Amino acid sequence: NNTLWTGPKPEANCIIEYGKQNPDSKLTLILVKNGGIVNGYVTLMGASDYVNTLFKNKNVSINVELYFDATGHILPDSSSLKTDLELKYKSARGFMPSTTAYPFVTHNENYIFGQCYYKASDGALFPLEVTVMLNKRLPDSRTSYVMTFLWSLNAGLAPETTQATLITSPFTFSYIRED
Amino acid sequence: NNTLWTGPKPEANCIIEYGKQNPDSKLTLILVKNGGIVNGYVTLMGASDYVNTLFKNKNVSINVELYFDATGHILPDSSSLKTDLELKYKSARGFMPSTTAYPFVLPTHNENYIFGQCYYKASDGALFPLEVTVMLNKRLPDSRTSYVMTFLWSLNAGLAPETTQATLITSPFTFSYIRED
Amino acid sequence: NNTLWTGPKPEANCIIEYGKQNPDSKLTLILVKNGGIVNGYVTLMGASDYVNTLFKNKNVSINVELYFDATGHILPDSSSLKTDLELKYSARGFMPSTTAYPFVTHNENYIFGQCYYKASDGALFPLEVTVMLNKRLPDSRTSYVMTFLWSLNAGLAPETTQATLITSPFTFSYIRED
Amino acid sequence: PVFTQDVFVGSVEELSAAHTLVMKINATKISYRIVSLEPAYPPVFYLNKDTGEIYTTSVTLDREEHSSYTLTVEARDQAQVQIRILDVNDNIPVVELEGMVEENQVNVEVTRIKVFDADEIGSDNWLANFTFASGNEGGYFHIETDAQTNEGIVTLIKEVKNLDFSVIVANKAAFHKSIRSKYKPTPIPIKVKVK
């Protein structure tokens, strides 16, 4: 087995707002093993009012952090995902970002950049600058691998004027897996 | 069996210019069954005059529609790719986009679009950027198809990328989607 | 046996200082067999003064060429790498397709993309990646050619002091030859 | 040792590819070596020390930053090399407006559209080729690039209301392959005033 789903169509399991304890956004994360590297898939979908009114502004930031452990399971009390990643058919250490190619601390060799696109409700298209940052940091002593996300936007005009459901396009990345 | 070919370098099999019998453009589409997703590959190449005179204008849009069925073959009646896809070592449901993650709607819906970009090198070497909009299912056209996967290469430039006629070759675009089990 | 390594954290194995005999820069090249295509992974780290003072200028083009033979090993006397690629545990299956990327305009031999160079203060200056497959034979024992190009243009320099050249990882896919 | 010439004269094109041949020096083993550069803050050129072919390197050139170069080579067991950079059109023209005409006056100048290119002065890469966008449907104004001072002269042809129009700036030659597909035509409007 070589898949860590969140789900094909998941429920609300990711939080965004600094202060909330309820899940208010859905995060579709799929990691598959492919030889010596691991591919990626990420799609955040809004599931509240606060995530839907985020794109009234012209400069936003959507921070999602996933603090793993020494086996491969998400610690739900310190990360931003309140639901463990479960496999497809059936030790998930072989899916983590490697600590030899991406070591712990400068160190700009941990970042993975890219771009996804937000399609507005009026018909226009807006690009979002994805920053995927591997390990670089220890938030506690129990954490052994860190994989964070960030969906920045800097546009001139506002994308929306009222509430619309925030869905981002799929983003694909690759990293070197821990053996 | 984890490769869905169109050929490494096929003949003219796609159809642009709506209302035409014979094919006029080549199309390479490679779908690899990789775990829980499908790693795609698409590349256009012109094989007539009307597809080659497309980039004399600055606001053009190339549209390719594919309509699969429930067992996983391209219907050659109403789609654009008039050639059934083969395997590498010849059912093909395992490469199709899943209806759990990308479902059909019938009245908006924006969770089944994969936006990306390829580039067009012109006749003098200038790279023009094209916008690709892969749209999974979203719209059942008739009563025989089961999966819909459309492509759309779009260009909105400031100048014309060509003045004479040259071969319209686009860059290899690499996407990913969730597959049907 | 479906990964061609250089090592996840290698030593110096590439030469960008054109006319210097020792290796002075590190690149990771990982090519995995994935069905009918091959996924790509490339980035470039500098390990000398000349590479790290490249990005004090506005227009800089960095060139890396690889010349495989008919078997699949790197010829270490003409290519830009100086150490051949190693498997995880011949290597003809990772080489690009002759019938899909043929030898001779021919714009069908190219794969374009984009990576980013985060500066010493942080500004996200984008570099344009140009991957060119076979297209050219340099001699009579070369049989497969891969060529990268990191082309930067900018209104002002990314840095005024030497820090370290690290490009972002880049992902590409090409048809392989069985 | 002693060369076969006195001053080597060469040329290279702006924004060329890496390891492009500039020129080939020669003399009467012979070890060619650049010993001095008069502009020295980038290493822009590279002399092949076995055969004497000046190549460009991984940092590419810029005519608008520095017009020409001068480097003195030395062959060991000296002579000047003056390399002049050939200009390409890698710079979009910009425009830094009002016009007052009278009733039915034929071939009277209106105003002068100023335009400030940054390429070589006197070529086709600095001469702004003015075209039209909207306003010459009835055939009213003819446009012209004055080659001495780079001005878009507009002058009545059919004599004659607030019949405004707009021009589009471009050069007389084609844009370079790194700057084309980034140029977008901005219609600069001009209001005329009849009396």
Author numbering:
A (entry chain C): 130 to 219, 225 to 239, 245 to 318
B (entry chain B): 130 to 219, 225 to 241, 245 to 318
C (entry chain A): 130 to 218, 225 to 239, 245 to 318
D (entry chain D): 108 to 135, 146 to 194, 206 to 224, 228 to 291, 297 to 331
Show me the paper's own sentences about this structure.
The first step of adenoviral replication involves the interaction of the fibre protein and more precisely the globular trimeric knob with an attachment receptor from the host cell. Desmoglein 2 (DSG2), a newly identified adenovirus receptor has been reported to be used by some species B human adenoviruses including HAd3, HAd7, HAd11 and HAd14 for cell infection. The intermediate portion of the DSG2 ectodomain, consisting of EC2 and EC3, has been described as important for recognition by the HAd3 knob (HAd3K), the trimeric globular distal part of the fibre protein. Here, we report the structure of HAd3 fibre knob (HAd3K) in complex with one and two molecules of the DSG2 receptor.
We recently demonstrated that HAd3K binds to DSG2 by a non-classical mechanism involving mainly one receptor bound per trimeric fibre knob. The interaction with DSG2 ectodomains (EC2 and EC3) takes place at the top of the trimeric HAd3K close to the three-fold axis. The EC2-EC3 domains span two HAd3K monomers, with the third monomer having no contacts with the receptor in the 1:1 complex. Each EC domain interacts with one monomer and targets primarily loop regions of HAd3K. In monomer ‘A’, the EC2 domain interacts with a surface exposed loop between the A and B strands and the C–D loop and N-terminal portion of the D strand. EC3 interacts with a loop between the G–H strands of monomer ‘B’. Several residues distributed along the EC2 primary sequence were found to interact with the HAd3K monomer, while only one region in EC3 (covering residues 311 to 321) is involved in the interaction with the groove of a second monomer. In the 1:1 HAd3K-DSG structure only a single monomer of HAd3K binds either the EC2 or EC3 domains. N186, V189 and S190 are at the interface between HAd3K and the EC2 module while L296, D261 or F265 are part of the HAd3K/EC3 module interface. Modeling of HAd3K binding to one DSG2 molecule in such an organized structure precludes the binding of a second DSG2 molecule coming either in cis or in trans without significant rearrangement of the desmosomal cadherins.
